[PDB]
């Protein structure tokens, strides 16, 4: 919590932070998981 973020750090690294949550959404995609509004196994649905 004390750690502060220089510019070349998170201050301009947030873009790869977004690219990486996109990395998790893609890895779900090639895991083969399917779309929906609510996350449930039987529904085969994913808000994210």
How was this model experimentally determined? cryo-EM
* Separation between Cα atoms, residue 4 and residue 37, nearest integer Å: 36
Greatest distance between any 2 Cα atoms in the chain: 45
Residue 41's φ and ψ, nearest 5 degrees, are -70, -45
CA distances from 29 to 15, 17, 34, 36, 39 (A): 21, 19, 7, 13, 14
* Separation between Cα atoms, residue 22 and residue 43, nearest integer Å: 22
Copy the structure tokens of residue 10.
């998170």
Taken in order 27, 32, 34, 35, the sign of the CA dihedral is positive
Copy the structure tokens of residue 43.
């529904």
Spatial contact of 45 and 36, defined as CB atoms under 8 Å apart: yes
* Separation between Cα atoms, residue 2 and residue 25, nearest integer Å: 30
The CA R_g of the chain, rounded to the nearest whole Å, is 16
Q: Resolution in angstroms for this experimental structure?
A: 3.6
Q: Closest Cα to residue 46, out of 38, 25, 31, 26?
A: 38
Copy the structure tokens of residue 48.
């994210």
């Amino acid at each position: 919590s004390q750690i502060v973020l220089p510019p070349h750090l998170e201050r301009i690294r947030e873009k790869l932070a977004e690219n990486i949550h996109e990395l998790w959404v893609m890895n779900k995609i090639e895991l083969g998981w399917q779309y929906g509004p609510v996350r449930d196994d039987n529904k085969r649905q994913h808000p994210c």
